[PDB]
Design a protein around this ligand. Structure first.
Ligand SMILES: Nc1ncnc2c1ncn2[C@@H]1O[C@H](COP(=O)(O)OP(=O)(O)O)[C@@H](O)[C@H]1O
Length: 208
């Protein structure tokens, strides 16, 4: 069956995790792009064999686990490797993402993609939801949460797509720079619409 996909995105410290949990409490399966990226290098995964062939047998421990720290340290001191690794992992992530989408039984799925705008992944979503906050909120909330400096987070903000680039592709926007508890009511409203969209998308004769 064709699953209805709502993609969630937002910059660092905007509320991706918080919003995702709100949808999960309503019974929606969350498919998280960062979890998928870790899944494709889990013990026994096909990517591990290719990684051992390219980087050396010792990239994989005796117990079949990827030596994460060891890979990170190799790729960081060999820039093009990041690109080699991403190319290897890309198709595998696409397949695992679809498999999980296929495996989810909720009325629609929430696909959480930090790099949605950067990687133009909104082209694979039926609906785009952006959790939005002010840049200052991103700074204060990320600093607190990760115990890092303001300047450190300012660099992440300048590396990520901008606030406006995200709003340009959004179908819906949830504001999180206010009270944490206005989240439940806004998510319920969006969920109600998403149930309708998902229930009629397959037969919907004309657009919206
Ligand atoms: N409305 C809010 N007010 C204050 N803190 C919040 C609010 N919403 C979420 N948080 C916190 O802000 C931080 C960043 O939110 P989070 O969802 O983790 O961000 P990200 O978008 O990076 O996933 C977290 O520690 C979270 O608990």
């Amino acid at each position: 069956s064709l699953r209805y996909i709502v993609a969630l995105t937002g910059g660092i410290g905007s509320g991706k995790s918080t919003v995702a949990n709100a949808f999960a409490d309503l019974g929606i399966n969350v498919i998280d792009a960062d979890i998928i990226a870790r899944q494709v290098v889990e013990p026994g995964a096909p990517a591990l064999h290719a990684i051992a062939d390219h980087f050396g047998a010792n990239m994989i421990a005796a117990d079949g686990t990827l030596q994460r720290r060891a890979l990170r340290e190799r790729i960081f001191a060999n820039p093009e490797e990041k690109n080699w690794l991403n190319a290897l992992l890309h198709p595998l992530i696409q397949q695992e993402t679809q498999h999980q989408i296929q495996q989810a039984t909720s009325p629609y799925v929430l696909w959480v993609v930090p790099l949605l705008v950067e990687n133009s992944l909104y082209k694979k979503a039926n609906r785009v939801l952006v959790v939005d906050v002010s840049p200052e909120t991103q700074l204060k909330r990320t600093m607190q949460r990760d115990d890092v400096t303001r300047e450190h987070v300012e660099q992440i903000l300048a590396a990520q797509a901008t606030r406006e680039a995200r709003l340009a592709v959004a179908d819906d926007v949830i504001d999180n720079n206010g009270a944490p508890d206005a989240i439940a009511s806004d998510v319920a409203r969006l969920h109600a619409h998403y149930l309708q969209l998902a229930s009629q998308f397959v037969s919907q004769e004309k657009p919206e």
